[PDB]
């Protein structure tokens, strides 16, 4: 019993964190096999940030300009290349702590653990979701760039995010491990704003099923809804549209609890209309949207 | 910017988790140097001295990854079983066994079959329970804090109470709370809110730009505690005020000034507003956690 926001154990990722320095700039790198991945903006001088020409800035650099530190050991950079917004620093030592890994690009609504790092040293681990507006509501200070987001499936680490910048609203933007930004963001100091964020509907429904699995049924009602009527209502509360894919994905949780997806949708519509009335669901006074259907099954079953 | 419920990096603890099997029961053990610590109920009105005397070393199957460890001795210390093994854990970190106070927070590395499954941050409630997330097989999972490179083990999971909350011991086997490791009628006492932690979280909200709850008012420690008693909040002591000093100095809001904001929040509610994305007052961040997260300390 119980339902917590749970991160993956970070050990496999901790043994990959290194410090990358270029000039006055220091940030984090991810050391996998003989390559260190880090944000390409490590080569920028802040005066470059408004309109940096990364290709022009990178061509002027040599391997010895990049200082990579893994613990108290300095690694030797033997090559460098840029892939989208990530810098790939070839090093002369393969990381003996390299876990079984994959680079995965996630969709909005997906969750992952973030190992926040400063100077190549892990400071903390927390759980995040890729917002529908492609930002993440993280906890990052200056020096956290290059910290990564991941999931662990069996003993394989799926790296899905690398931190690049903080937007003016306090939300965070980054890329997958191939350097492709999530969202319409660029690694430039130009005027950029996150789009209007919306609630991850499928995740709220998954969390309502988690509440039912844990014995909370107060919010259930005798109603059902069509998918279209649900979407017309949910859109008015800035909730993401619920698709047939989401309905299918919720099937296992519907079967386990005996509450049809459209029946749970009717409960959600009522919660949006009434609020909670001084009550809580799984210890929360707000509807939680950073638990996916997969997270609910994993945490409530194994 | 941002404020998250953050756990310590779990790596140093992951390299200590092993599976312990005795009879039909499988749970988790903590392998430090040549000893595996686990709940004594793995041998199960239980007379644990009598149950333990009937067990030989080879009855305890300890598995560290895909390697079976050989148990060369066994002894009980309070509610923890100490299984001496032939091999010292090469991954043993710098560690201490520490007993924490209610209100103190720690990270839990939830484990099943000696394999870490997740890490979450929680607090020792004033009623000595933890609102954790544990299923069958999670017993022996541990709670810890990390200071510099030293892991302070402070909790070992033993059982779930009927209300879904959890109970366990320190690493010396002493229960937190008036609990016993036996299938019997046990209930968690009435819980209260950790006041010093709510204040720390309000300072974290101010540091992150949320100030709507602030007011011009101040209060006395006695008047605040009279209000705190009414809302099932733990008494705030002069020690708590002193501990909040650094946050008070950084934000410019005196501790009793923040107390008057908290009193108004308790008597009037949030009124449709939120603080750090929460509609409830959060009490599972200590003043140290707020400073550590809003400064970026590393391990
Ligand atoms: C508080 C402050 C300085 C923004 O530091 C941060 C806080 C949290 N996460 C990241 C940073 N740093 C950056 O965003 C550096 C940067 C600036 C412009 C463009 C880019 Cl791509 C990167
Ligand atoms: C759901 C269920 C079976 C309680 O499993 C749990 C769920 C979460 N954390 C632990 C457990 N198991 C136990 O509590 C086993 C147990 C039973 C009686 C006495 C003791 Cl000391 C231990
Ligand atoms: Cl995805």
Curated annotation (Swiss-Prot), chain B:
It is found in: Host cytoplasm; Host Golgi apparatus; Host nucleus. Residues 1-299 form the Peptidase C30 domain. Changing residue 199 to V: In strain: Zeta/P.2. It catalyses: TSAVLQ-|-SGFRK-NH2 and SGVTFQ-|-GKFKK the two peptides corresponding to the two self-cleavage sites of the SARS 3C-like proteinase are the two most reactive peptide substrates. The enzyme exhibits a strong preference for substrates containing Gln at P1 position and Leu at P2 position. There is a cross-link at residues 5, 84 (Glycyl lysine isopeptide (Lys-Gly) (interchain with G-Cter in ubiquitin)). Cleaves the C-terminus of replicase polyprotein at 11 sites. Recognizes substrates containing the core sequence [ILMVF]-Q-|-[SGACN]. Cleaves and inactivates human TRMT1, preventing tRNA guanine(26)-dimethylation of tRNAs. May cleave human NLRP1 in lung epithelial cells, thereby activating the NLRP1 inflammasome pathway. May cleave human GSDMD, triggering alternative GSDME-mediated epithelial cell death upon activation of the NLRP1 inflammasome, which may enhance the release interleukins 1B, 6, 16 and 18. Also able to bind an ADP-ribose-1''-phosphate (ADRP). This is 3C-like proteinase nsp5. The lineage of its organism: Viruses, Riboviria, Orthornavirae, Pisuviricota, Pisoniviricetes. The gene is rep.
